[PDB]
Amino acid sequence: DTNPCEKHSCIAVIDAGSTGSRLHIYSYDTDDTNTPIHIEEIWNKKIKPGFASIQPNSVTIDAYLTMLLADAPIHNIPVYFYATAGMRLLPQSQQKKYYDELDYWFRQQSQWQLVEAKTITGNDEALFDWLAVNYKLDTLKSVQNKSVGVMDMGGASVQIVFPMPKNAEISKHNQVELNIYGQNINLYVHSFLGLGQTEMSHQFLNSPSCFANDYPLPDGESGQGNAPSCKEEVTSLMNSVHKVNQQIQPLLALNPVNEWYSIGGISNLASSQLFHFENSELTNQSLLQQGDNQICHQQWDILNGQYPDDEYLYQYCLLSSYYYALMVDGYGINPNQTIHYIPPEQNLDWTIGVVLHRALE
Amino acid sequence: MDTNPCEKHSCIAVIDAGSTGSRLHIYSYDTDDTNTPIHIEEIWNKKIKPGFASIQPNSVTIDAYLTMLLADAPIHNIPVYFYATAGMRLLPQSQQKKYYDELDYWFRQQSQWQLVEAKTITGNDEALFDWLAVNYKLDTLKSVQNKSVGVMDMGGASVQIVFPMPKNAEISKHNQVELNIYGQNINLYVHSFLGLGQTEMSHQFLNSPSCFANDYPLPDGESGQGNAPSCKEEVTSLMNSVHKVNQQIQPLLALNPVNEWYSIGGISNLASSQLFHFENSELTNQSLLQQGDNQICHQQWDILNGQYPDDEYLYQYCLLSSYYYALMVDGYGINPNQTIHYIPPEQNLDWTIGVVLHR
Numbered sequence: 244d245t246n247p248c249e250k251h252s253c254i255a256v257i258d259a260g261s262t263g264s265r266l267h268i269y270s271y272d273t274d275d276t277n278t279p280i281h282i283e284e285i286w287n288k289k290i291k292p293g294f295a296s297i298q299p300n301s302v303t304i305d306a307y308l309t310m311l312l313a314d315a316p317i318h319n320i321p322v323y324f325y326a327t328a329g330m331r332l333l334p335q336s337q338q339k340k341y342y343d344e345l346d347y348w349f350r351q352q353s354q355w356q357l358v359e360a361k362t363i364t365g366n367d368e369a370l371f372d373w374l375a376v377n378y379k380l381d382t383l384k385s386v387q388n389k390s391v392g393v394m395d396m397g398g399a400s401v402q403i404v405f406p407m408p409k410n411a412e413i414s415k416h417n418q419v420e421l422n423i424y425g426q427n428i429n430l431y432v433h434s435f436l437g438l439g440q441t442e443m444s445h446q447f448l449n450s451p452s453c454f455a456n457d458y459p460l461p462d463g464e465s466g467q468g469n470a471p472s473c474k475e476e477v478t479s480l481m482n483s484v485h486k487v488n489q490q491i492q493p494l495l496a497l498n499p500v501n502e503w504y505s506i507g508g509i510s511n512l513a514s515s516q517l518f519h520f521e522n523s524e525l526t527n528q529s530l531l532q533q534g535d536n537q538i539c540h541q542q543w544d545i546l547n548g549q550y551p552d553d554e555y556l557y558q559y560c561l562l563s564s565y566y567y568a569l570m571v572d573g574y575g576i577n578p579n580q581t582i583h584y585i586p587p588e589q590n591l592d593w594t595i596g597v598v599l600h601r602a603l604e
Numbered sequence: 605m606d607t608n609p610c611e612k613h614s615c616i617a618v619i620d621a622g623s624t625g626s627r628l629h630i631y632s633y634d635t636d637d638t639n640t641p642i643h644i645e646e647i648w649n650k651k652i653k654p655g656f657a658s659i660q661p662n663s664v665t666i667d668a669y670l671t672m673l674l675a676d677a678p679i680h681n682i683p684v685y686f687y688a689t690a691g692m693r694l695l696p697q698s699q700q701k702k703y704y705d706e707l708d709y710w711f712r713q714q715s716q717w718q719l720v721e722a723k724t725i726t727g728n729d730e731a732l733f734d735w736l737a738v739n740y741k742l743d744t745l746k747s748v749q750n751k752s753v754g755v756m757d758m759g760g761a762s763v764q765i766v767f768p769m770p771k772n773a774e775i776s777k778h779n780q781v782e783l784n785i786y787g788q789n790i791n792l793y794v795h796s797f798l799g800l801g802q803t804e805m806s807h808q809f810l811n812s813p814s815c816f817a818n819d820y821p822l823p824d825g826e827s828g829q830g831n832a833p834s835c836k837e838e839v840t841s842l843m844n845s846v847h848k849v850n851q852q853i854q855p856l857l858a859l860n861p862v863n864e865w866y867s868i869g870g871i872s873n874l875a876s877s878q879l880f881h882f883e884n885s886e887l888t889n890q891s892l893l894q895q896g897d898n899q900i901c902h903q904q905w906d907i908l909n910g911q912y913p914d915d916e917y918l919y920q921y922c923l924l925s926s927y928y929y930a931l932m933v934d935g936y937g938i939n940p941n942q943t944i945h946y947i948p949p950e951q952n953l954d955w956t957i958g959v960v961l962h963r
């Protein structure tokens with residue numbers, strides 16, 4: 244429609260992630276419970292870097308919010324600004340500086356109506372991850388006979404979320420009950436702060452097994468790639484430090500997931516020119532093999548010169564190893580189980596979940 | 605110190621471009637018979653935040669940053685060494701290049717500062733400078749030493765350890781340095797651990813209730829329930845199960861004992877908080893861990909926060925006490941009752957005097 248928000252409800256949801264912010268404007272209608280239906284993305288804009296990486300002063304906040312919002316084709320609508328793991332790495336005292344400046348920016352203008360601007364927990368983010376994916380799969384309308392699990396592979400945290408009946412023995416913070424479209428859904432949620440790709444990588448930059456042969460490690464040693472070896476190193480951070488296996492595997496053993504979907508960074512890796520997967524799905528076995536043979540075991544100078552257009556390339560041995568460590572050695576997923584990934588051209592994040600669910604923990 | 609010292613002595617500028625900020629130092633010095641610097645004195649300094657690697661590298665932001673760092677210095681017509689450390693080492697060379705190409709251009713557009721080097725140094729180079737700087741200040745370089753001095757630099761993104769060790773052909777050449785200064789031959793073991801600096805390592809423990817004061821609000825919505833011995837075991841898993849600190853350092857330190865330990869970097873800021881009780885600018889790991897456990901881990905966060913409201917790092921003190929013990933005792937193998945000297949934090953001592961001595 245010419246102006247969609249004249250005939251439908253519209254809100255703006257901003258995903259303020261660790262590596263960038265994404266504005267989405269959604270139009271929707273509501274059913275007879277006032278629940279959104281027919282959700283359509285009418286605009287998006289993605290900027291970098293992340294909000295938490297900028298200096299929190301009025302000039303810098305204005306430049307950033309102007310870049311994010313000023314060219315939108317629709318305004319005069321409510322805005323939800325929800326920041327994720329990049330902000331969670333800062334204490335409340337530091338985050339307050341950002342929100343006081345952001346709140347002032349919104350008060351000083353008239354085109355957007357700020358409703359909320361806050362850092363959400365990783366558990367809230369995980370609920371939104373599951374809602375957004377399941378909305379896109381059309382699995383929310385009716386009671387499913389299949390369990391759908393979602394993983395969001397972010398830059399600073401990763402989330403996992405799947406159906407699990409309410410359990411008096413698990414923290415209330417890791418369990419969510421919602422009623423949507425007249426069904427009652429109970430989920431386990433967990434986020435692992437520091438296990439996102441950027442933050443994790445900072446522990447392995449001097450691991451020769453994690454980089455192509457002769458890659459120049461920052462300590463002056465040479466890469467000598469070997470994905471199974473790098474995977475074992477990353478598993479030590481997953482399990483000896485974060486205890487991912489002990490927290491997740493007993494729960495998935497009791498609440499098996501029939502279909503896994505992943506969003507976040509893994510879509511970019513799996514879709515890159517170095518990897519080959521069909522049907523927008525992968526297995527961990529194939530992901531680790533491809534990284535091992537196409538990056539880890541190659542000569543870095545040669546490979547870098549072959550693929551000059553990919554600034555992410557140098558990390559692909561490490562990332563393929565890390566995803567396997569996280570999914571197989573941490574979550575316990577079978578290396579041969581299909582993991583669907585949402586094509587990156589969709590730019591799909593968790594923001595549709597906010598449209599559907601306005602509460603937070 | 606003279607009026608206009610650089611009109612009367614040789615001067616150089618050394619910039620420590622660290623992960624949390626950049627520090628310009630200008631040193632005047634005389635030279636001995638071998639044209640080696642002596643009488644090194646800091647005649648200016650300026651510290652800015654954030655780190656150079658944290659900015660977006662384009663001509664506008666680089667200009668603003670270097671202007672902020674340099675413009676008000678009292679003399680500009682001197683050699684400059686710009687050495688970045690672990691914040692830049694977190695980035696691949698292709699990304700670093702953007703920063704140095706802009707930096708180089710900026711220096712070429714002006715006609716006073718004489719840029720000699722602008723580069724990222726390795727953790728091993730940084731460790732050498734750490735040792736030189738601390739030993740210069742202790743006055744132990746002029747003559748051969750009755751004792752072994754070890755230096756630790758507890759930075760934001762990496763930590764360094766450095767101590768005397770005869771050459772060992774079984775150990776990487778990268779972890780050993782031989783130098784001759786003031787006519788003496790010195791052999792050092794050097795190592796840096798990227799990712800084990802305080803800021804970087806803290807990002808793995810923010811949701812660990814044992815690492816924060818009681819009722820501190822963790823990012824996941826749970827509450828702090830501090831216990832320093834439990835938090836220390838979590839950090840030790842990162843030191844040893846992930847980075848293998850103990851396997852790399854302990855066998856060498858056992859055979860090349862250090863008589864006196866000195867530390868620069870974060871530990872000086874922590875140890876100087878009035879929550880702690882230390883004397884003579886020194887501590888032991890056992891005392892640090894016990895004091896963090898009692899004064900922070902097991903106290904109510906609201907009480908502490910209201911008592912020290914000026915102190916932006918307070919909330920981390922249970923974690924930091926635990927982390928320093930995990931790194932020094934469980935990682936390096938230092939006895940927990942061994943004295944660790946810390947340079948008083950008001951000195952703001954970094955490794956930059958090492959560059960004056962080495963270049």
Ligand SMILES: Nc1nc2c(ncn2[C@@H]2O[C@H](COP(=O)(O)OP(=O)(O)NP(=O)(O)O)[C@@H](O)[C@H]2O)c(=O)[nH]1
Nearest residue numbers: 260261262327328397398399400440507508511555
């Ligand atoms: N291979 C590749 N990776 C990309 C590309 N663009 C972004 N990434 C990486 O994908 C990872 C996941 O990114 P994303 O899910 O957007 O993270 P985020 O939402 O910013 N972080 P968080 O959710 O933790 O706050 C990030 O480390 C990012 O650095 C690309 O073009 N290619």
Ligand SMILES: Nc1nc2c(ncn2[C@@H]2O[C@H](COP(=O)(O)OP(=O)(O)NP(=O)(O)O)[C@@H](O)[C@H]2O)c(=O)[nH]1
Nearest residue numbers: 622623624689690759760761762802869870873917
């Ligand atoms: N406890 C405490 N820590 C502080 C204070 N001010 C700064 N720090 C922290 O002390 C640590 C060491 O800082 P510094 O030595 O300047 O690190 P750097 O040189 O910027 N980093 P690097 O050497 O790894 O490149 C950092 O993690 C910094 O965030 C303070 O007042 N108290």
Ligand SMILES: [Cl-]
Nearest residue numbers: 461462727798
């Ligand atoms: Cl290094």
Ligand SMILES: [Cl-]
Nearest residue numbers: 364365823824
């Ligand atoms: Cl969280």
Ligand SMILES: [Mg+2]
Nearest residue numbers: 260327397398
């Ligand atoms: Mg995200």
Ligand SMILES: [Mg+2]
Nearest residue numbers: 622689759760
């Ligand atoms: Mg430093």
Ligand code: NA
Nearest residue numbers: 442445804807
């Ligand atoms: Na980190």
